[PDB]
Each structure stands twice: as structure tokens, then as C-alpha cells.
Design an enzyme around this catalytic site. Sequence first.
Site, PDB file in Angstrom:
ATOM      1  N   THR H   1       0.825  -1.202   0.000  1.00  0.00           N
ATOM      2  CA  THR H   1       0.000   0.000   0.000  1.00  0.00           C
ATOM      3  C   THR H   1       0.863   1.258   0.000  1.00  0.00           C
ATOM      4  O   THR H   1       1.587   1.527   0.959  1.00  0.00           O
ATOM      5  CB  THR H   1      -0.944   0.036   1.216  1.00  0.00           C
ATOM      6  OG1 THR H   1      -1.822  -1.095   1.175  1.00  0.00           O
ATOM      7  CG2 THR H   1      -1.769   1.313   1.212  1.00  0.00           C
ATOM      8  N   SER H   2       0.780   2.026  -1.084  1.00  0.00           N
ATOM      9  CA  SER H   2       1.533   3.261  -1.239  1.00  0.00           C
ATOM     10  C   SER H   2       0.574   4.427  -1.428  1.00  0.00           C
ATOM     11  O   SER H   2      -0.390   4.333  -2.195  1.00  0.00           O
ATOM     12  CB  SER H   2       2.498   3.177  -2.428  1.00  0.00           C
ATOM     13  OG  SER H   2       1.793   3.024  -3.647  1.00  0.00           O
ATOM     14  N   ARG H  19      -5.391  -1.945  -1.853  1.00  0.00           N
ATOM     15  CA  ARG H  19      -5.115  -3.318  -1.452  1.00  0.00           C
ATOM     16  C   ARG H  19      -4.568  -3.359  -0.031  1.00  0.00           C
ATOM     17  O   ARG H  19      -3.691  -2.569   0.331  1.00  0.00           O
ATOM     18  CB  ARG H  19      -4.124  -3.977  -2.411  1.00  0.00           C
ATOM     19  CG  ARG H  19      -4.666  -4.241  -3.803  1.00  0.00           C
ATOM     20  CD  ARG H  19      -3.630  -4.954  -4.660  1.00  0.00           C
ATOM     21  NE  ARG H  19      -4.102  -5.181  -6.022  1.00  0.00           N
ATOM     22  CZ  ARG H  19      -3.349  -5.672  -7.001  1.00  0.00           C
ATOM     23  NH1 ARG H  19      -2.081  -5.986  -6.773  1.00  0.00           N
ATOM     24  NH2 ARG H  19      -3.863  -5.845  -8.212  1.00  0.00           N
ATOM     25  N   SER H 168       3.073  -5.524  -2.970  1.00  0.00           N
ATOM     26  CA  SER H 168       2.391  -5.081  -1.758  1.00  0.00           C
ATOM     27  C   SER H 168       1.510  -3.864  -2.010  1.00  0.00           C
ATOM     28  O   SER H 168       0.546  -3.633  -1.271  1.00  0.00           O
ATOM     29  CB  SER H 168       3.413  -4.775  -0.663  1.00  0.00           C
ATOM     30  OG  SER H 168       2.775  -4.303   0.512  1.00  0.00           O
TER      31      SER H 168
END
EC number: 3.4.25.1
Lengths: 243, 244, 241, 125, 231, 250, 195, 196, 226
Positions: H1-2, H19, H168
Site C-alpha cells: 500500500t503506497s 489493497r 504489496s
Amino acid sequence: TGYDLSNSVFSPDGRNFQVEYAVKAVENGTTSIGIKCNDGVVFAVEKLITSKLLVPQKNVKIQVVDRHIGCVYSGLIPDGRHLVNRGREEAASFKKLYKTPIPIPAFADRLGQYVQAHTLYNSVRPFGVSTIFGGVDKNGAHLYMLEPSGSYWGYKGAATGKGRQSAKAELEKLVDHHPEGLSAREAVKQAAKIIYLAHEDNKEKDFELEISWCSLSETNGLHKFVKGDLLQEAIDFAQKEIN
Amino acid sequence: GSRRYDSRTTIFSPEGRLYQVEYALESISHAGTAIGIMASDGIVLAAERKVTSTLLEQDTSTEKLYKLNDKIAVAVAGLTADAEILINTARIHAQNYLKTYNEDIPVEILVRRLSDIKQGYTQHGGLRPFGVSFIYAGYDDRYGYQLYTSNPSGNYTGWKAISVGANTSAAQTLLQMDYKDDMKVDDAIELALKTLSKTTDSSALTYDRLEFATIRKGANDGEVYQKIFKPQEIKDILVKTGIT
Amino acid sequence: GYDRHITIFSPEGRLYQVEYAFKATNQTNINSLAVRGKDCTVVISQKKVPDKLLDPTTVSYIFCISRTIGMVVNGPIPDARNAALRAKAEAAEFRYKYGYDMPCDVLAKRMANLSQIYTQRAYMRPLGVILTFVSVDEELGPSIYKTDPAGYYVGYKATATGPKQQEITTNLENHFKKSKIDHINEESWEKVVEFAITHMIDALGTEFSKNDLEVGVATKDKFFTLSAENIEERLVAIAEQ
Amino acid sequence: GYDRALSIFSPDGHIFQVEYALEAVKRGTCAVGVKGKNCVVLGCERRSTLKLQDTRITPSKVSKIDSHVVLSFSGLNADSRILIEKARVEAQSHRLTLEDPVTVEYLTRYVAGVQQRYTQSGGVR
Amino acid sequence: NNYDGDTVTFSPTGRLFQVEYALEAIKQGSVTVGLRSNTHAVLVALKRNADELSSYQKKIIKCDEHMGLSLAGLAPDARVLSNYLRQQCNYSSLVFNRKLAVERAGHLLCDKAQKNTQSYGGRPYGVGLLIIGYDKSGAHLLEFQPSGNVTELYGTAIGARSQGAKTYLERTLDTFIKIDGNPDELIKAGVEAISQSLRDESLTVDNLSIAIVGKDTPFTIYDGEAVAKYI
Amino acid sequence: MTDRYSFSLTTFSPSGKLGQIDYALTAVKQGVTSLGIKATNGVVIATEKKSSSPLAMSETLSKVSLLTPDIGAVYSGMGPDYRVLVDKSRKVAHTSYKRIYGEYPPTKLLVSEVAKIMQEATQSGGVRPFGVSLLIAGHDEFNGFSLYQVDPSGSYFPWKATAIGKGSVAAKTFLEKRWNDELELEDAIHIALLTLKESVEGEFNGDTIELAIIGDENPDLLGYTGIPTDKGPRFRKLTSQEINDRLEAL
Amino acid sequence: MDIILGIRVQDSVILASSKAVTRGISVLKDSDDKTRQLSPHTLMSFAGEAGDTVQFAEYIQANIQLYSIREDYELSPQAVSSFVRQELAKSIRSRRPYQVNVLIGGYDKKKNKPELYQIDYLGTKVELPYGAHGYSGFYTFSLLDHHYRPDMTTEEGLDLLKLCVQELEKRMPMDFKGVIVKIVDKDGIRQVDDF
Amino acid sequence: TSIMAVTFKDGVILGADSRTTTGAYIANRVTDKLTRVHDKIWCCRSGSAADTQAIADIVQYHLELYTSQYGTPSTETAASVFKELCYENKDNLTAGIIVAGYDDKNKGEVYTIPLGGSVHKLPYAIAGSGSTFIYGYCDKNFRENMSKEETVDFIKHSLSQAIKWDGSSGGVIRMVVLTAAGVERLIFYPDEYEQL
Amino acid sequence: TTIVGVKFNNGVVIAADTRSTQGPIVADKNCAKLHRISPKIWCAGAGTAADTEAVTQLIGSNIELHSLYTSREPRVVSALQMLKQHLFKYQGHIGAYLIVAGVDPTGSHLFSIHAHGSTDVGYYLSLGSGSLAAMAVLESHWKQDLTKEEAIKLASDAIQAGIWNDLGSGSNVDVCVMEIGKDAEYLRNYLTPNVREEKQKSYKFPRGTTAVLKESIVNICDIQEE
């Protein structure tokens, strides 16, 4: 009877007896007024001189909250300094968490928490002082006058003390002078004249001119005391007007 | 000047006895008449309820008979508000002794803990002392059956037969001449019933308005068995005594 | 006579402090008119003529508790601020815990319980002000609840607070009786404001200007107060009829 | 107290609390004792005139604080349900902390100190 | 008239009468006279006793090396406030590493004294105090009053016959201000002022107590033969 | 009275009874007329709504509150004074009972805490007790139908047929002679309608007359199916149309 | 260490407590009283961590003596073990755990029968005809069950203890320098200095 | 997660990866990483979702009291409240916070709040797991006062490198427009930025 | 443990089994995982069943009061926000895996809680040890706006697939059908894959096999009066 015996009790006339006695305590004292202009606010209050033993620029009662809020009261001296010391810890609590100067419209509520509650509680006596504070914030200039009963209102001008009746009629004349309000230096000269006309009852003893203003013109949002040639300019101007 | 005695009860009265206790004694006389009797075969407890006519159901609800344990029993005559506090409090203190020491609590120690609660109000603070009188009927393995009386002053004394309400001194006189050391369970039922009729203005005392409870030693293995007599069984008591 | 003058009960059975709390509201001489519309709510209170008081444009007798929730207060102002700040703190923790807007029933239910708590306190006196909580629920629609100094609260078709409230209630009694409905049939909030001003003039017996009236507007999903130009616009349209 | 003040002195230097506290002893039962050479005799008066009183179950007005130290009072039995229990706790505490049998002079200061503490403390008698 | 027994009720005059009853303790107490300058400060207080064999208790309490005061009024209300100022002087010299300001000390005493008077019951402080101290701004004398007002003066006098010394200080005020740096002229000035207030009382070394503090001369209590030269 | 003994209501009074109790009994007799009737097939209660302005909402004011789904209540007195005890009674029943016992407490154990809360207000000197009377009715499978009456003194007693408020005196004789334990629940409803009429007539329509009955378990009011052990609430509220049906059939 | 052993014979209860108290390595004193006398009819010992068991049995004895004076009646030994268990139950659940074992036994005057209760450091009330603590009890558990009978008198229990102590000191290297035996019967506490 | 935010001429656009990855398994890919405490004032959230949702909701009712009692909040006033909570909770609660609001005077403002908390004015903020790849890419193509449509494609191409090259961080990109016009939320199907 | 849910137009349906296993040995065959908040909102817990029911009784005694105070239907978000604040009161020391599913006057939503107190939103969620097994089965069955009949069939196939795979899930499965405007339908013993087979050899022992030392008779009732 039980009516006037204990305070914080409703009365059959709708007004508590402590409110009428609190006003009489505010009426006894010097004369404090204020002027709310378009560029800022101007405060004026009489300084009673008992004898020559007093040292000038010492007993001045005007306290400044941060740089943007001045404070002046008329009433019991210990109750006035006590309410200001509370507001200092109250205003510092907002700047601590929110990191922003406290707005003046909401600043009257922090001082109102102490005044309005002491009227409700019997164990603590309400404040017998009338505090007039103001300044300039991001929302513009604001001027408020807090009553000892806990109520408060905003004012373009206000008068408290013994000479509040004669000074209130003079403040209404300044409205007809300019529709947008007098300038920063123009209000100081007109405020001092109202002060000099209020010494008729106070002529028994000596008085000292006390004026503090906060505007966006010279100070750019700072509250300072009149010093230098600005003090002597308002004295000689209003001295010839009362002649 | 003055400005005293109107709040805290710690200030003594001019007579040396708190007037709040004297006014609590009058509230006791306004309640019913509960007459206990201590005997070697058990303890008899009987009282006449305040509520009346036909509207209140008196079979299920009994405010003058409360069971702390299978042995200790109490008779509540007085204000109900002040009595209810000690009811759950005595049950806590009685079970704590049964929890810690695993034994039946004695009446002398149990009432002493309850007597200090009434005394603590007149001691610390201006709280109201309890003006309700309890009749403690219990059995121990040392002194046998113990019968005390809880006064609003906060003390207690031993009594073989005690009476409350109206005609307090008159009821103790009738029970003195009729007192017997060989008195059985049934012998204490009839004499306590005839005394209650004379000391009260109501000679009727039906089965519903009168509460009757007796602890009997004649149970199995001589164990203490508290039998709560329903008003249906109380009606048969009047037939055996011939009053009704 | 000492207990009759304080919060302690009296042989009459009703506390005199509640009656003296109601008499202090008529001393301010501030009338209020609040009716429940169809999809909205308009609250109009009589605005005493300002001179130096607050801002010349708007002197606010209506304190907004939170989003889509208004309040109007009669009686002493120093008791209104403590009641307004307390209602806001209860609304913040409510939307945080239950994630939902403060209902109109509980908003007046918790305030009524606080009034009984202060009566049980000998050191602190109860609130002597009449609190009226107005809002518009999504499912329940517009609703108005007024809390008397005694604490009793119930829904009102048209509520009024002041010395002349008997004339406002009587004049508005036949308004909903003629239409046989408990609200205003007008869907738009423009005509609702013009109607409440008309009934207010005949009830009190005098007209008013833009500075003599404060018109609150309670709508769905949003809340706002009409400015001096919006209030004056409603008065001009009525004069052109 | 609401507006009332609970401080009581009176111009005679003797508070009304102790003035009427001694009256409860005078109006109550009488107590007497005599200290002999080899023994101490403590008399006590009880009222048996009331009907059907049992002495065995009735707590004795003469209480035993320690084996060699006893106590007897005169007055209402209600106030004795506390002060006597305090001296009994201090009796076991003196034999514990100091490993000393109960001192008659020290225990007397504790019994007199309970009432001494309530005279100077407000809201308590 | 129940407003004299209740401190939480506003009197019809507008201010409590208990303060005026507390002002009589200052006049009936010890008579003290003091004055200051731009360098030093002098306080001359009278010591009294209840018997000829009774010693004269010092009316001057030292809360700091550069700061001191003198008490006239009730005994309990005095030393209790002295411990508060003693902790504030040690709090500023430790946390802030600077001597306590004279104006800050006055505001702290007003908040502590008003807290007991404004609240129900409490312990009202009816003693007056004359506080002298030196800092970067020079000597300062702030008169402490039980009414809650603290004003900074060059000098004043309290106690019985306070108008006798007050008149002498007003006419001689212009003379005492121009005189600085000389302890002999400042101490002797206070002796002639208190002599007018004292009636039917002789001036001896044990009765009068003189203390001076300033930049060059620290706080020193002159007793016995120390005041024999100045008197 | 207002004597030195009445400055603090926790102190005793020379009259022999607490002054706060006598002051509370006045508000009970000056309140609205409420009652209850415990029959064999159910418990029916009747009350009249407090007279208010014609612009007020009658459906907003509810004289019948539910502490538990199987237990109803009716009151006469101040409105806010009733909701304070309800907030505490519902909390204690769901804390000291529902949590540890896993089920709602019965009517006998529920009223025992309601009286105990009022007793704490009687002992407190500053806190004054409430002057409202409480009629609580419930149904269970152990003690069956029960109707309790809570006095301001802090106690509770069951009553087969009783009434509270201003019309409690006239209803005491009417409900005793006209109603008995042999009558069913349907006949008790017609008696409750004629009982309120004896005190005052006015308008007998269901708008100002709030009626509540306690029947058997209703599966439609349960909200789900669940296990067969759990059953629906035993309380059923009469609507405005159902009240007028008993009026024309009276 | 700190052997405390006891056995209930027919007419009395025989309890034995260790003499020598060993602090660390060296033996500080060879004679000490490891038991406390609650009532004339009840005897209780203590063993465990140094300093915790000494202070434990003190205030327990003060509370029992205090409760006995209030009722003018001696607390029964059966209720003594219940009060000790209540304090030991809160000791393990407190911030400072206390491991204390006690042997509570005596002659009940109501039933005219002796009783002996064994309690370990866990604070569990257990009634047994014989009991011990430490690592020394492991040898005496199987020996007393094979020999001792409910019909054994007091004199035979003393000679049987001499055989047990002789085997405990011979098998295990530890030496307690003898034990202090106190007979508890209807006549009260009777000390025995022959050991 | 960014999570990242880029200011434009009339305001700032906020975006986040929806996500939520626990270990090697994705629990839910639609999870909302943006909690709304005010209409024009929002705050980005990254890291542990429990500590971010808690701190954001605690401030949510702070602005509600600040709006009625004081006045309309700004970006500088609202962002300082998150710092006071993270200062004492730094050891107890570790969560990343990015507060980017909008005003009618100073327009958009972005303040980066570290794990311990602080207030720093920056034109853009970079935080989260997959944000490791966007440091050098975003600064090269960054411009002063970018166009509204150019800023959308800027963050879309910035996250595309972080979503495609790091597991991720990913999911449906949700962009919002904070300006004087109003609030406009955008939704982007993955293949839109995966082909670019 | 396998728990999932399916949302449709007229409401939401959930599926949970009766199997609860402690360690390698199965502790209980029939254990209800369905927890009660309000009659119109039902939840299912996972992980530790002891702390889950304790929190259920904690909120079950709270939101029920607030539902009676407001005399209305609490929102679905209210059930989620309270459970999130509970884990914050315990400082996250209690791992709680649940599913928030219910209806309100606003609509029909779905939520879930995590161990640390995180909250998520979605149409289809899985729970328990078979969360990965049941979520994978529905992947090919995703379709927008499913009917009520397909909501039960697609949910039952995901649970039945987890029974044959996850050993911690199985035995009886309880399906709770919640429809807007209708009471919740609780189906007990919906799916029973276990078939009990009769023993081939008789294990019943006749009376007198086990030895008894001594016998005694006790009574639990009160003692006799005579």
C-alpha cells in the site's frame, strides 16, 4: 428571607440580586471604554492616582494575550488579574494542540467558562469585574465586553464604570463621524477626549492617561502601548478641545 | 449565631440523646407489631402487616420476613428504605464469613457489624441513621438459639421474648407470666397469638394480613429447618386456636 | 419559608425554582416562532433592535449545535452558552462512537436528564432557560422539541417562547387545523419563510425589518442561516403581493 | 451545611458536644471500681427490670482487652461497639510490633486518643 | 445584615465587609515605615511584646538574599504567605535561573489570597505586607493589601497613625528620590517618619528594626548596637 | 413546614415521617390517572396522556415504557423524572443480570433494583428523591404475571387491581367491586375503559388514551427465528385503531 | 529443607518441627522454634522461604486471637485451615507470591476427636493422619502407611518417629540436629524435650 | 500500500492503493485508505490500518467541535492535531499519516507527518510500502502548478511503476479533486495504467 | 472454522458451521458461531470463541440499551464502530476476527474487524481457518446483483468445499438468512456431511462388569419436617 440570604438562587423578579450588586461593584472604580475600528481596536481606561507616591508605567492593568489580544477590566482589582491569569492558561491550551492563535469570537467562551459557572455554583463567588478585550485575527477585528453575570456581547464601542452613561452617548457620536470607523491615530485622539470628559466625577484625585490599541496599520497585527510622541500628541489635541 | 444542628447529626441534643433517634422511635410505633420468642426448641416470629383490604396480594409478598441463612432469620419492623440496605449488606457479611472461614456466622458478630453501620452515620458524616428495628433469630453450635433486638441507637441486647410497635411494655407483661422453660413449639404459637390480639387494635388478624414463621428443632437429625408458613397454612392456625 | 425559596421541596408539591426559572425568560422579551415544514424546518425568533450589540448585520440568538442541527434559546444568555457547549460535546462523542447523527429525541433526552441532575445538586442551580432543539432527520423528517425549565419535552407543530407566545400559539392553531396536516405542504423552503413571517406579524401585532428578524433554516444534509440580503429578499416579495 | 458553619466553641470555653455527652453517662447506668493491693475490682450496673432478658447471650458490659488488662464503661452500649473493638486491635498490634505485653498506660492513650481525634476532626463527634 | 458572615454573597455596598474588618488588624498591629530609591531599599518596622520580660519578635522575614519583606497584621496569614514566596524564589532561581520578578510575586499572592476568599469558607488572608527586592530593574517596593491590590510605590506607611508618616513621605518624596547610593541618608529618613506615627512610645534599639538591601549592600538585619548610630 | 429539620431532607422530621416523602406524595395525587390490572390470560394497563397544547404531538409522549421486552410499565408524574430511573433500570438489568445470568432478570428482581436506586436518593442529603409513582407489570414462566407498585418511600408491593394519580381514589372502589380474579383479560379491558371515565370524561378516543397489554410470546415481534429456547416478547402495544375498536364494542 | 512432620495418633496429635535453621551454607543456629501456638487446643507450624513464613503466621495468629476474644470462644481448628487458605489464595494472585506450608492440627472439644490438616505451599487444605514437607517427606510417606494404624497410641508414635528421623538423617546428608515434638491433646499443649 | 499526493494549480489530488496485504495473502483489495474528517480537509493513511483508522477518527470529532465552537478549519490547523496524538503514542502507536487539505485562501497544502509526527510544508508526499520506487520517478517529472489533467496522469504513471513493480502496493487507483468546484472522486481500472 | 457471507438486493446471508476444535482433538461437534447484537443484525466470530462471546455480551448489553433509548434501529456502522472501540479499550490484547453484517433504515452493508482493530468493507468476505479455502471457491462465482436463491447456493458450495479441505471446519453448518423487511431466518443443521455408522460389534457391557467399593445415598432436597 431566603431570597437575599444565599446567592445563586432565582428571584421572583427574574433578575438575581447578585447581578444588581455586581454592576454596582463595576460602577465603582475608574472609567474604561473601547473603540472598534475597521483596521483594529482601541482601548482606553482611566488610571486613578491616589498620591504622588505612585510610580508610572508600573500599576498599568492592561494585559496582552499573546501579541494579538489586549485585555482591560473595570472592577475589583484581584478579580480582574485573576480572570486574566486564567485566560492565559486557556489561550495557551488552544495554541498547544491546534498550533494556531485562538479566534476572538471563540475566545470569549474560554473566559466565559469561569464566569458563567461561578454564577451557577454557590461554593465559588462570581467575578465582579467587566472585562473588555479585543484584537485582530484572520477573521478580522473583534471587540467584546464581558459582564459579571456571564453574558457578553460584541460592540463597536463600549463604556463601563461610573462614567459609562456619559461615555456611551459620546461613543455614538463617533459613529456619525465616519461610517467605516475612525483611523488608528484618529481614534486615539477622540478616545482621550472622551476620557477627559469623564473625570468630572473623578476630579477629586489625580488621573493618568492610559491607552492601548491593536491594528493592522503600524503594528501589522500587534498590540502595543502608546508611547513616544503618540502619547503627547493625543494629550495636547484633546486638551484644546475641552477648552 | 446558631447556624448549627440543622445539617450534621454529630451535634448532640440538649437532652444528651439525638432527637433524630427519638423521631425514629415514633416511626417504629407506626409500623406493625412483631413479637419474637426464644425457646430451646426454636424461635417463633409473628407480625401483622400494614397493607389491608382485598387489593394487595399478601400470599407471595412478605416484607417482614427475610431469610439471611438456613439458621439466622430477621424480622423487619420499621422503614423499608433504611432496612433494604442492611438486607443485602448482611447477606454479604454472612457469606464472606462462610466463604473465608466456611462456617455459619454467629449472631453476635453479625449484628455487631450491622450495628456499626447505624452508628457510623451518627459518627461520621450527616447521613441518616437507620431507624428500622430488626429482630435477629438464629442458632449457633455454642450458645444455641440467640435472639437480639436492633435499636435505632445502634446497640443490641439479648432477649427471650421481645415486642415492637404499639403496646411494647404491655406485650412484655403478658409474655412474662406465660413464660415457661419447658415451653414447646406449639405452646409458643398460641400464647404469642393471643398476646398479639390484645396488644393490637385489630382483633381480627386474618390469615393474609398476618405473617407467621417458626424455626423448629424437630426436623430430621435435629437440624435447623426454617419453614415459611403460607397464609393458607396460617388460616388453619386460627382454627386450632379457636379465635376465628 | 427557607426551603420554599431554595431547591428544597415545598408543601405545595411543586418547586418554586422552576417557576422563577420560567419567569426569567419573559424578562428578555424575545419571541420565537418555529414551525415544521415538509422537507425542511424554519425557525424565526423576534430580534430585539441592536445598537452596538454584536455585529449590526446579524445578532445571533440561534446557536448551531452541529451539522443539520439548530437550537434557539429563550431566557438569560449566560446560561445558554453552557447549555450550547455541553450539547456540542455530547454530539461529537456520539458521532464518534455510533457513527450516526444525533437524533432529535435523544438530543432533548440527555439535556433533560442534566436538568434533573443540577436540581439534585445543592451547590449548583439548574438551568433557567428554555432550550428548543430543531433539526431535520432523514427517515423521521423535520422535528422540533422544546425543553422547559422543568425538563419536559415533546414534539410541537408550532412552538413559541416569550410573553406573547399565547397569541402566537393561538394564531398558529388554526393554521394547521385548516390544512388538516401537521406540516407545511410547500416543498420549497422559499415560500415557507415568507409564510412564517406573515403569521408572526399578525400574532405579535406589528411588522419587522431585516434587522428585526433572524430566520433560521434547517435543511437536509446541510444547514445554513439566511443573511441580511436573504431575509430582506423575503420581505420585499411579501410587500409586492 | 449549605451556607452554615460547623465550627462550635461557645463563650464558656466548653463546647456543647462534650456538655451533653457527659449527660448520657449521668442518665445511663452507674459504674464503680476499686483497685486493691493484689487485685482490681470493677463493678457494673445492669437493668434486669425489663421482662425476659438472657444474660448469657447478652454481651457483657465488662470487656476483656488483654489477659491482664480489662475494660468497663458506663453509658450507651451503641458507642461501645466501636471504641472497644479499636482497643482490641491495638492490643494485638502492641504484642506484635513491639513484642511487648499490652502497656496499661500506652493502651489508655490509644483509647483516649480515639475520642481525642474526633474532637479536632470536623464532621465527626 | 448577613453579608458580614458570608464571603460568597455580594454586599449592597458592592464589596465584602470582611475585608474592611481585616484592614483593622493592620492598623491595630505593628507600625512600619519604609522607602526605597534607584539603588537600595529601607524598611523600618516596630517590634512589640506582651510583657516587659517578653522579647521582641522580628517582624521582618527574609525570603531571599536580595529580597525581603515586613509583616503588619494577623500572625497566621503572614508566615503562610512567606513560605509561598520562599518556594517561588527558589523555583525561579532554579528552573529559570533568574530572580523572581516583583510584579510576578504580587500576582501569585493575589491569586492565592482570592482563592480562599472567593471560595466558600477557606482561609482569608487579612495581613498587609511591604515587599522590597532588587533585580536588573532596580529596587522595587510593592504594597500588599488583603483586599487583593498590589501597588508599587517609592514608600509608604501602615498601622496606627499611618497618616503621620504618610504626610512626611509625600512632601519629602522629591528629596528621597534624588538621594541614592548612601545608606545613611535612606535609613535616617525612615527614622524621622516613624517618629511622627509613634505616640507615647519611646524609640530604642530593641523596639525598632531596620533592614536595607540593594545592589552594593545585601539584605542585613540591623539589631542592637547596629541601629544606635542611625538613631 | 420548612423547619430546621427540613433544611437537609435526609434528617428526620418532628412529624414522625420524612418530609421528602410527604412532599413527593403531593405530586402523585396531582398527576395523571394511571392504573393496571392483572388477569389470568394477561395484564392490561390504562392511562390518560397529560393535557398539553393542541399543537403538541400525542404520539411523541409515551406513558408506557419497556425496561425488558417481556415487562411493561406505566407511570404518573413528571416525564423526565421517569426516564432517569429507566436509564438506570435498563442499565443495571443488562449489567448485573443479563451479563452474569445470561438472561433478562424477572419482574421481582428487576423492581428490587428500581426501588434500591430510589432508596439511594432518599439517603443522600443533597440528592433529592423523585416524586413519581411506578407501576411495573411483567410475565414469565416462573412467577407468572405480576404487577408491582413503587412508592416514593423506596419500597414495592404487588397489587392485583390498583391505580395511581388523581383518579386513584375513585378507581380503588370501582376496580374492587366491578373486577375480580375470576374475570378474563378481555373483560378487564372493558373495565379499564370505564375506569378512566369515572375520574374524567373529556375525549375518550385513543389519541389521548394510551393502552398497553401483556400477552403471550409473539413470534412476529422477536425479529428472527433462532433457537427454539428463545421466544418473542410478551408485550403488545395497542395502536390507535385497535383502541377505538374496543370503544364502539364497549 | 526445614523439616516439619506430624502424625495424628488415637488420643492426641504428634507434631514435630525442625531445630537448626541453616542460612545459606553455614548453620547460623541449631535450636529454633519453627511453630506458633494459636490456641491451647491448636498448634500450627510454618516452613518455606526465609522471612516470609515467619511474618505470615504472626498476623494470622493475631486475627484468630482477635476473633476469639470478640465471640469469647476459641476458633475451631477446622475453620483455621479455611482462613489460612483464604490468605494463601490471595498471596499467589498478588504482585508478590508467597509460598507457605502449614500443618494445622489439634483436639476439637466439641466432637472430642483430634484432627490434623496438611497444607502445602500452594495453600490447599488436606486432612491426613500423617504429614510432612520438603524433600524429607518422600521417605516417610510409604513407611507410615505400611506401619501406623488408627489404633496406635501416643507412646508408640514417639518411638516410630525415632526410627523415621534416624532413616532420614542416614539416607539424606542434611542434618537438622533433632526435632521439637509437642503433643496436642485434651489436656492442652505438652512439649517433649527428650528429642 | 503506497500513498501519495501532488498539488496542482487549483488544488491537490490525493490517491492511495486500496489493497490490504497480510503476509502473502490479500484480505481485501477495495479497502478505503482515505478517512474523511472534513469536507475539504482529508488525510492519507498508510501502514497498520488499525492505528491509522483510530487516530483519524479521534481527530474526526475534534474538527466537529472546532467547526461550531471556533470556526471552519484549515489545513495547518487540522494537521497539527494529528501531531499531538502521535507524539505521546509514538511508542504505543506507530502509523504513517499524510494530511493534505484544501482552503479558499491558500488553496491546497500538503503536510508530511512521520511516525513520530511533525509538520512540514512540501509540494508532494511519498510514503507507504510500494513508494520505495517512486522517489526518483516523481521528482524528475514534477512541475510547479501542473494542469488538472496533467496531474491525474502524473500520479497514474507514478503509481503504475509502484503497482506493477511491487506486489504489496496495487489495486484500483482512486483519485480525488479538492478545489473550489467541489469534491470529485475518480476510479481507474488496472489495465488503464498497466498498458502505459 | 469457515465463515463467509453473500450480499444480495433484498438483504445479506451468512454461513457458519458448528465445528469448534481445540488442538489436535475436536472439542465439540455442535458449537454455535453465530453471535447476537440486535435482532436485525447478526455476526459470526472466529479465533478464540471465549473472548468473542464475552465481547458479544459486552456490546449485546450496550447497543441494546441505545436501541431502546432512541426507540429506533441503530445503524450498521454503529455496530462496527463500537466493536472497534472495544479493541481499543483492551489495547488490542484480544485478537477478534468477526464479520459485521446487518440492515438499518439506511440499507444493507457489510464490514469486518481484525485483531488490531482494523475495519474493512466489501461485498464478499471470508473468515476462519478456511478463509482462504472458501474465498478461492467463490472467485469463479462472482456476479453482480445475485438473487436470493443463488445467495444460499453459492454460499453453501463455498462452505461444503471447505469441509472437504479444512479439517477445522465441518459437521453441521448453520445458515442465517437476513432479508430487508423480514425476520432473520436461522437454519439449524442445514448441511450434515457426517454419516453415523452403526457398530458391527456390540460394545454394551452388562450390569456388574465394573467393581464397586461401597455405596451411599444422598438427597439434594430440604430435610424432612417430621
